[PDB]
Design an enzyme around this catalytic site. Sequence first.
Site, PDB file in Angstrom:
ATOM      1  N   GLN F 274       0.806  -1.221   0.000  1.00 38.52           N
ATOM      2  CA  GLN F 274       0.000   0.000   0.000  1.00 38.52           C
ATOM      3  C   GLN F 274       0.840   1.273   0.000  1.00 38.52           C
ATOM      4  OE1 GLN F 274      -3.822  -0.094   1.938  1.00 38.52           O
ATOM      5  NE2 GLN F 274      -3.435   1.867   2.937  1.00 38.52           N
ATOM      6  N   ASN F 275       1.908   1.316   0.790  1.00 35.72           N
ATOM      7  CA  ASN F 275       2.710   2.533   0.840  1.00 35.72           C
ATOM      8  C   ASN F 275       3.507   2.736  -0.440  1.00 35.72           C
ATOM      9  OD1 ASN F 275       4.512   0.382   1.381  1.00 35.72           O
ATOM     10  ND2 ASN F 275       5.978   1.893   2.146  1.00 35.72           N
ATOM     11  N   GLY F 305     -11.910 -11.780 -10.135  1.00 33.98           N
ATOM     12  CA  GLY F 305     -12.498 -12.346 -11.323  1.00 33.98           C
ATOM     13  C   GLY F 305     -13.028 -11.280 -12.252  1.00 33.98           C
ATOM     14  N   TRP F 307     -15.430 -10.847 -16.342  1.00 35.10           N
ATOM     15  CA  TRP F 307     -15.988 -11.447 -17.544  1.00 35.10           C
ATOM     16  C   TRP F 307     -14.987 -12.390 -18.190  1.00 35.10           C
ATOM     17  CZ3 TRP F 307     -19.898 -12.637 -20.585  1.00 35.10           C
ATOM     18  CH2 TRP F 307     -19.631 -12.935 -21.922  1.00 35.10           C
ATOM     19  N   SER F 308     -13.846 -11.851 -18.607  1.00 32.92           N
ATOM     20  CA  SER F 308     -12.802 -12.691 -19.176  1.00 32.92           C
ATOM     21  C   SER F 308     -12.166 -13.576 -18.115  1.00 32.92           C
ATOM     22  CB  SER F 308     -11.740 -11.819 -19.837  1.00 32.92           C
ATOM     23  OG  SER F 308     -11.257 -10.852 -18.922  1.00 32.92           O
ATOM     24  N   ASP F 344     -15.471  -8.519  -4.085  1.00 33.32           N
ATOM     25  CA  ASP F 344     -16.651  -8.862  -4.872  1.00 33.32           C
ATOM     26  C   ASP F 344     -16.316  -9.956  -5.874  1.00 33.32           C
ATOM     27  OD1 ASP F 344     -19.149  -8.923  -6.000  1.00 33.32           O
ATOM     28  OD2 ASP F 344     -18.761  -7.234  -7.341  1.00 33.32           O
ATOM     29  N   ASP F 346     -16.724 -11.946  -8.983  1.00 37.29           N
ATOM     30  CA  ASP F 346     -17.339 -11.782 -10.294  1.00 37.29           C
ATOM     31  C   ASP F 346     -17.053 -13.012 -11.149  1.00 37.29           C
ATOM     32  OD1 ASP F 346     -18.551 -10.937 -12.589  1.00 37.29           O
ATOM     33  OD2 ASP F 346     -16.919  -9.587 -13.149  1.00 37.29           O
ATOM     34  N   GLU F 348     -18.975 -14.857 -14.077  1.00 40.98           N
ATOM     35  CA  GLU F 348     -20.118 -14.594 -14.939  1.00 40.98           C
ATOM     36  C   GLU F 348     -21.255 -15.542 -14.605  1.00 40.98           C
ATOM     37  OE1 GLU F 348     -20.819 -12.192 -16.604  1.00 40.98           O
ATOM     38  OE2 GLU F 348     -18.902 -11.143 -16.653  1.00 40.98           O
ATOM     39  N   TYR F 349     -20.947 -16.826 -14.488  1.00 43.88           N
ATOM     40  CA  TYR F 349     -21.868 -17.730 -13.822  1.00 43.88           C
ATOM     41  C   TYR F 349     -21.239 -19.070 -13.479  1.00 43.88           C
ATOM     42  CZ  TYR F 349     -25.987 -19.260 -11.736  1.00 43.88           C
ATOM     43  OH  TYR F 349     -26.849 -19.666 -10.757  1.00 43.88           O
ATOM     44  N   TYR F 423     -27.840  -4.957 -16.682  1.00 45.12           N
ATOM     45  CA  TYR F 423     -27.563  -4.221 -17.904  1.00 45.12           C
ATOM     46  C   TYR F 423     -27.295  -5.182 -19.050  1.00 45.12           C
ATOM     47  CZ  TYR F 423     -22.865  -4.862 -15.953  1.00 45.12           C
ATOM     48  OH  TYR F 423     -21.718  -5.359 -15.381  1.00 45.12           O
ATOM     49  N   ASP F 424     -27.331  -4.629 -20.265  1.00 42.68           N
ATOM     50  CA  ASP F 424     -27.207  -5.398 -21.501  1.00 42.68           C
ATOM     51  C   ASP F 424     -28.303  -6.446 -21.635  1.00 42.68           C
ATOM     52  OD1 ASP F 424     -25.019  -3.816 -21.541  1.00 42.68           O
ATOM     53  OD2 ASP F 424     -23.543  -5.435 -21.396  1.00 42.68           O
TER      54      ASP F 424
END
Lengths: 36, 166, 243, 499, 83, 631, 167, 27
Positions: F274-275, F305, F307-308, F344, F346, F348-349, F423-424
């Site tokens: 962090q520093n 994670g 999409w790709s 979080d 992510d 996609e499924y 969205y989409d």
Amino acid sequence: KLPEYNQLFPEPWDNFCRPGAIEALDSPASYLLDLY
Amino acid sequence: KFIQSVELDGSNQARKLETRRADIPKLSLDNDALYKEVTALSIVNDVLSGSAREYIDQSGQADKAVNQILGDTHFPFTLPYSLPTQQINKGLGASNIELGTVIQRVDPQFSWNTTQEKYNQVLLAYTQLSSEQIALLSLPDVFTQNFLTQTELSAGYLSASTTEIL
Amino acid sequence: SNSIEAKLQEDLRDALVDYYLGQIVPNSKDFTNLRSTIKNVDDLYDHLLLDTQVSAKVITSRLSLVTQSVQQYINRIALNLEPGLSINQQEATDWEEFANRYGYWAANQQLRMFPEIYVDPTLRLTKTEFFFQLESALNQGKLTDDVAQKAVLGYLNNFEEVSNLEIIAGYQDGIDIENDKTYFVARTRMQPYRYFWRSLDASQRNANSQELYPTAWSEWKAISVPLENVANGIVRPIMMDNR
Amino acid sequence: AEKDLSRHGYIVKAADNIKGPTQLVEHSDASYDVIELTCTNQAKETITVKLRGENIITYQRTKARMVPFDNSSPFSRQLKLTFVAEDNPSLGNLDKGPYFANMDIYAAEWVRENVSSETMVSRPFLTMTYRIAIAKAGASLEELQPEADAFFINNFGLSAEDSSQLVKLVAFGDQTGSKAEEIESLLSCGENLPIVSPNVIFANPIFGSYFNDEPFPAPYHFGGVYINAHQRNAMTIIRAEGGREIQSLSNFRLERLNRFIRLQRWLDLPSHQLDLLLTSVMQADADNSQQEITEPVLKSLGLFRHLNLQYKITPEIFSSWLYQLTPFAVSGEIAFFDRIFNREQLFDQPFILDGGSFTYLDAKGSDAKSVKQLCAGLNISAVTFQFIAPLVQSALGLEAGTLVRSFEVVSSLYRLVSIPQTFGLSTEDGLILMNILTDEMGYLAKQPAFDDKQTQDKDFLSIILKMEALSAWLTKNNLTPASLALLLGVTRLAVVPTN
Amino acid sequence: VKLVAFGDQTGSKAEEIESLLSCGENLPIVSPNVIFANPIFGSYFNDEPFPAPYHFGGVYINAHQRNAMTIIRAEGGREIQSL
Amino acid sequence: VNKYTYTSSKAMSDISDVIGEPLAAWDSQVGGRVFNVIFDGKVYTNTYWVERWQVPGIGSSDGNPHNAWKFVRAATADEINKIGNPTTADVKPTENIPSPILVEDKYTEETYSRPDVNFKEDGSQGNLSYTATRVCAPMYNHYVGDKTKPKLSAYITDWCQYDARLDGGGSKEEERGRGFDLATLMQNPATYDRLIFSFLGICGDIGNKSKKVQEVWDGWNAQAPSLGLPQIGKGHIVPLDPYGDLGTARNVGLPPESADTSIESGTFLPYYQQNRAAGLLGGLRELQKKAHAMGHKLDLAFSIGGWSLSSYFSALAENPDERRVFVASVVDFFVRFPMFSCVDIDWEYPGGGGDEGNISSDKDGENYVLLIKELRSALDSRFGYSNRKEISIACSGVKAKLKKSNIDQLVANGLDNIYLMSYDFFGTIWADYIGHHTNLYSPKDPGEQELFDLSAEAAIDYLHNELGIPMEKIHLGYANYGRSAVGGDLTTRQYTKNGPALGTMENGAPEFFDIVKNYMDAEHSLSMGKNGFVLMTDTNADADFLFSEAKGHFISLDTPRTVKQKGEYAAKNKLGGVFSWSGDQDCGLLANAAREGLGYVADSNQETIDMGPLYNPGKEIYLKSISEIKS
Amino acid sequence: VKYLFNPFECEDEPALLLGKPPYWNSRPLVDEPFKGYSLTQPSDPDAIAASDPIHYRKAVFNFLTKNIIDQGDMEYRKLQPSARTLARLSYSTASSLLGRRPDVQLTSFWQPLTLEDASYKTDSDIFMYPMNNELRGLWDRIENRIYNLRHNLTLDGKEINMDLYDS
Amino acid sequence: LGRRPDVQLTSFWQPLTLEDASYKTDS
């Protein structure tokens, strides 16, 4: 965790007797018993 | 300002200051909040009573007198209380008089010969106890001295020894 | 008279406290969490940051009382008692030093505001070696003009030699002349030969200035070694690893 | 603070040379009232001019686009005037001497002046004054009111022009011969701020609403009353610009002040109690709508001097004798009123001053009894209370069995108690002496009066002085009011036939 | 049943409790100069501490039952005899 | 704050006390004053903040979208003569612009000029603008915070941190990057409540970017022995661009002297703390510092994670030891960068249906139950409750997915947040028919929506009811772009699939600021379509889109209206929060619309620009549902 | 004292990461004994503490706390009023180092015996280690000051009022 | 020293809560 006497010296207080009582490891009674 | 800044630094779990005593940032800076003097007790009881008043509102009973709640809240042990009884007690105390004495003297008839009921009630007054405490002490026992069911009764039951008692 | 009211005020407080611990904390919604632990009058004193057990004999201002409570809160977090809300080392030092107390906080403020008030010639930090001698003369006790004159003339006399000090050699603290400090050695023209060292920083420039703060020059300092046995009036200083 | 002012209006003070709105109306379609003013320049140059006058309200809102406009509330309410050439173009004013007539306006309530006996009428509550001049020349002050400069010379040693210097504190304190701590002790605009009793209700959230921001209580409410003449724009310090300066200084208030501070020197009193006493007097007199120095005022001061000297009478006491008790204090102390009643807590509820009534005759209703008992907390015996209360009710005109939690009842009682007590006479005895003097017991229950039909039975002050004198004479002669009244036949001695 | 919870909920400190139980040093005492009806407690195998708290000082709370309430040695804290 | 003051007056005699405003013909009006405006002889009183288009006749229904203008037929015919009847109302943008929005970009202009692109706003030539973010000024207003208001968050797709045209590049197509600079937000730290720099990867990546995943994995394992650290293996998290994260300065609002290009897969590892961070992450640190300076709190979180980067998740989820390595590397990251409060996930499924480069198994939602339990336990026991981190999921926008997600068990495992990828809902190729991409509600009879007419409503209703989940854990996304098609037929919603659908960086994907640059304008105090485009609002689904007839260019998108409406809905439903998807693409216009929709209020009575005038709705159209078309 | 031990320690110190336990700052005071020592500690408090460094820790704690009380006592000895607030604060902090006294846990259990009884019984534990006196000394000292503050008394607990008398 | 600057020193004040001061003291 936190800074407090017992936290620094973790010990069940019940493991001690009240001062001044006969139950005291140094009671005058205890002194007499030792002498006897 | 310092504390206000520090309390920005995370740890939502903490019981942040204004969660308590929220009046404190609300106090106005002024000459009199500075200069004039009051007993600390006054503030103590005030703020605490405010909290209690909110709580009774949470009981949905704000219609009730906050003092009156203490008239029947039996727990904790010292809780049951009665302002008027105290007022009377100290009143006559300042007069150096006992309530029983007052009533006894107020009876039209002579104390050396008057009805038993009056003697009774006067003596009760001399107890100095509140009616609430009186009632509480007067309640009948909830529990039988012992309680048993067929399981242990089949296992057999022994009372304590008895000849030792007298 | 009033003592009666004191009695009933105290017992009112007592009962009210009992009610708070007896019902509010164990039952009320918001305390569902804290009732894990807040369980006694001292816990109240801690949580509420105010003392309930004061007697009616005590009076205070609203402001002062608030201040007291705030201070308690500060000290507790400083003491690392509440969860989270840590404090930086300097920040804490400032608190425990002066901000803990109004008098010292005010003193700090006043110093910043009007340092001149705090200035005292006897308390100078920067101070010539011989300046010590001079004050060690004047401090004798009761005094007279002529005697002071004698003293200052002595100081002046030594100052002559100061103005006659001759540099001999110097050594750089490191490769970066433009920021590394450097040290120097010098001796008296007058005999017996006496020797002194001093240093100069290459840092301490103003970012705007093609110049350095006066502080960059060190004081000239005496050397105690019985150097007169020196071979040829020659010496070298070395500073390394801060020695 | 003692009345609502959400709805109110203004009317022209009736004068033979002015015509216009003379009554308030609950509604009108006209944007402005029209007024016509007849006036004369001292050359006997006489002209009349039209003018427009309009009540104006103003309010504020945040851009909280999610909530509806939710507008209804009390609001700031103000008066605006405007002349226009279009209404008076014919008058051709180039040569006219510039000086013309006075203008005056009542700020007035409109209400059933007798809630029972109808009388729904507009009725004043404040009065204000103006002078109008017309000078096409754009004349100078020396033309308009040259008298001002002479005044400023005689009373300030200066040209009227020098007021423009006087606006700064330095020049002010200099010419006044005063140090500014006195001035803040006068203005209460700094730390010497007013204070209010927590235990008192007020007639309207005049200052209780969200957007309210006048510091309450205002100096024009208390402590700065006479000098601000109740106008909301009170005088205050204001931050410097080439030195500290004063908020607003009409010559009118300047001359009020010039008098006031001299009187303050002579009486040697802090400003707050001086102002308090003064206002108490002038407001008690129904005639002094204009907060004007007047004979009864001076007379009152004489009485205060005398009584303060002889008996250490506190001006608050005197003030609350001739008027209501004050629910206010200066920065630094408890209010006299609240001190008198919430002197200590003896019950659950503090005593509070409120609307509403109670059946004092018996007050068997627990709350009514509580109220009455707390009032009896005013030193006197409970039994005494019942001698006083019917008289108070009767004098104030309340329903026989009822009393109300308002200053009027309070002050009446307080008079009846304190006044004889100042002579060591029981409040009981006072009734006796009052009847002896007037054949009325409840005399002190009444409000003070200065009736032009001046008669011996009317001057509170003379009557008080008489009480003083006769009390001295009585004790001198080792008498007793009861005995005296009996001998004088003011009350009968109990007797019956006998064997 | 444990002293801590007890004293807590009661709002009491344990010196009061021993002043109540007399099971520690606050023990009962008896006059040497008085005869008693039977060696109820005078026989060889007698070992009830005499006089008992149920004889004196603990009477109302024990309702004379021989199994009187007393402190008892700890197990994860000190505890009470029988409740 | 933001106060305004107004006044009313009457004849001095008038005792009345109602706020008054005389009658007038309904021209346009605006603001906070009371009004009593006549229209068709009915006088309509203003009930809300007046807006330019708020015709009172329609206003009988809603004089503002919040409420009707109430009215009475009070006026006499004489007064009708006196005032006149405004009844023939019309819309009118301002003659000029009160506040500029668009700004020049020499390099984007050159990009249009670039004959290999030949981009033109009519779609006649190059359909992809590659318009850099440079074309717009910062639009964020300052708002007063409110604990009761749900959170505003944003996801930044951090690759946007580059554009070779900045240096002189842009010769290649892909050289024409976004160049999204943090400085704009640094100037306005109050803008966001919570921020996420998007994706993070893991060693096992099978996706196209795995080239880099492997190369940096090897670089890490090259450095670590020289540092005495153990080698990382599969399941270990890994950075994506060490120079970007730790060495950039120019495009991350940092003093360029702090930049260090030496940072790379074989050199970054010492800096990975962090520093030492002197790149994007350093910027984030400074941003929080300035948030404290402003006296506001900025929350930092990170998604793992993407999409790709979803690619390896099934294998990771299956292997418990790789799950262990994952948890351990996560802990290590939190320790290196304590500024992050939350993570979080992510994928996609888990049960498939994400990117095709994904390993997937119908046991992975259960493996994720395990994963959540494990991570929760480990992190909670490690950091303690005083510093309890948050766990979030990027929930799929489709019923079929969320059904399989076992989300109630994840909540039993203490899941904290559920960011719905609302969205989409439509895509420029796979969809059969043109449709909205992020519409709140579905049209009437939308069918089961496995391919069309999807909506956030359709997902969240099931999640709250059929799954019983508290929406306080749920957060709604708004997208900083439109999607487009070509050859669309509005009646059948047919369209020319496989064509040059208008976009910025890629086909069919017009980014919002670029939409303003090319096809729509607001600067004339009113939203209107330009260059052959027209504003359309489907009253069926209640959704906004641009249309152009010349090439059937349909473009659904989020708008001030839709975003405000989303805020209104979120408040109405006490949702956990809302967030900007790809925050890099909104200059603050719809961000303001979001704040206002949720009901935040400005501090001053002044703004960067008023979003108000732009809530003018798009042209009415009833876009038939696919069910309505087939029936 | 800080060099030995700081209760105001802050986790900003990476020494914690370098394994330094909280608050303690002396490695000799912290690190462990291994009984490579005498089986019995004959008579020196220092030697036995050198085997049980905990004992030094306790001593240090005591010294610190005492010093705090000493400051508070000087403050309360001051004449002017506001110093009382300082004393109040100091004492508060000190108390915070101890929480509540263990009264209930200490409560005594006893049964009488003759010396003969004890002599037989002690064939191959009726007492316990009591709480060591200095601790209650500290507790009581502070409690006494607190009481005086309860009642507006001098540090000496003497009345501050003049106690005027008349009839 | 001439004369002490009393008038020039005279204080102006308006009360506020701590909350008020905290907000007011923003940049």
